[PDB]
Amino acid sequence: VTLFVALYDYEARTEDDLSFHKGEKFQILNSSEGDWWEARSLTTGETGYIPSNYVAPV
């Protein structure tokens, strides 16, 4: 299981990443260090590349 939370908001400036507000949960599927993690939003259902440092394990 992987239920992280956005410690801060995020205005996806591109369609590649996602957008949300500090407090939104996310399901990390592919991290592997780096910088851009692919988490699926449990609200919309689609996934995107959100900032790995913008989310933490709950």
Side-chain angles (χ1 to χ4, degrees):
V1 305
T2 0
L3 267 305
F4 284 54
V5 216
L7 310 137
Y8 315 120
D9 71 336
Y10 178 29
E11 259 206 37
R13 65 190 139 130
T14 173
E15 58 224 50
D16 266 70
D17 314 299
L18 307 137
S19 35
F20 42 93
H21 269 60
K22 68 206 181 189
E24 252 201 7
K25 316 290 230 83
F26 284 119
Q27 290 230 334
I28 307 304
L29 327 169
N30 227 345
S31 21
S32 169
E33 62 167 86
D35 228 19
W36 287 102
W37 277 2
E38 30 270 51
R40 204 236 254 177
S41 44
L42 300 135
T43 293
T44 23
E46 274 269 304
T47 190
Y49 294 92
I50 60 125
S52 69
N53 179 88
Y54 267 68
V55 296
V58 73

